[PDB]
Amino acid sequence: PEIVGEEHYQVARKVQQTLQRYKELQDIIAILGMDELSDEDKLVVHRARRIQFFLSQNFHVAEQFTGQPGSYVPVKETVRGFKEILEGKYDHLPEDAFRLVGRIEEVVEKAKAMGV
């Protein structure tokens, strides 16, 4: 926190904690099933899917292969985006529209294009 800042440090450590908790549930989900875990762990894997898809970007380099023009995302805006996904603001959006977006407003600009 003395280097990156305090808010960035709490958001990054909470993202690491929820992705670690989703990593610990890999065999349970894969073998025993999805409908049997609990609540407050289905919420964990619920937010963890939206987190581990939002970490991906559309690159400027992949414009020649996919078509979408790419994005450069500042650090304050991705800290704000992961804070908003950790707080639960975007739990009603699907697990797509977090795939391959730059900013956090592009998530809702893609989800209004697909669905709700």
Partner 1 sequence: GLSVSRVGGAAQIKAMKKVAGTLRLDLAAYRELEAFAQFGSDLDKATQAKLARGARTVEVLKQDLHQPIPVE
Partner 2 sequence: ASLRDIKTRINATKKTSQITKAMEMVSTSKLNRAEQNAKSFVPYMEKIQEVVANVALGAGGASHPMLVSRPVKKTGYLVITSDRGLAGAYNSNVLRLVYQTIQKRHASPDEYAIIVIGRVGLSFFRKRNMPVILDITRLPDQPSFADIKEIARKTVGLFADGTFDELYMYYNHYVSAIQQEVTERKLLPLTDLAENKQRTVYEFEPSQEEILDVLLPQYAESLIYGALLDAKASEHAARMTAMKNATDNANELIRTLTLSYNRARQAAITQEITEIVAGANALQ
Partner 3 sequence: IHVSVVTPDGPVYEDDVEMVSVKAKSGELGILPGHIPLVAPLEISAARLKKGGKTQYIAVSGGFLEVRPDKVTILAQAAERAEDIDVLRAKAAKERAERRLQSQQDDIDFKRAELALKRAMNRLSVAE
Q: Does the footprint of partner 3 cover residue 36 (CB under 8 A)?
A: yes
Residue 68's closest CA among 30, 24, 26, 113?
A: 113
Can you say whether residue 93 is alpha, beta or left, with left for phi > 0 and alpha for psi between -120 and 50 degrees?
beta
Q: Does the footprint of partner 1 cover residue 2 (CB under 8 A)?
A: yes
From 22-30, 48-56, 93-101, 103-111, span contacting partner 1 (CB under 8 A): 22-30
CA distance 32 to 35: 9
CA distance 91 to 71: 24
Q: Does the footprint of partner 1 cover residue 36 (CB under 8 A)?
A: yes
Q: Does the footprint of partner 3 cover residue 35 (CB under 8 A)?
A: no
CA distance 15 to 17: 5
From 12-20, 21-29, 50-58, 106-114, span contacting partner 1 (CB under 8 A): 21-29
From 28-36, 55-63, 67-75, 99-107, span contacting partner 1 (CB under 8 A): 28-36
**Site residues, partner 3 (CB under 8 A):** 24, 27-28, 31-32, 36
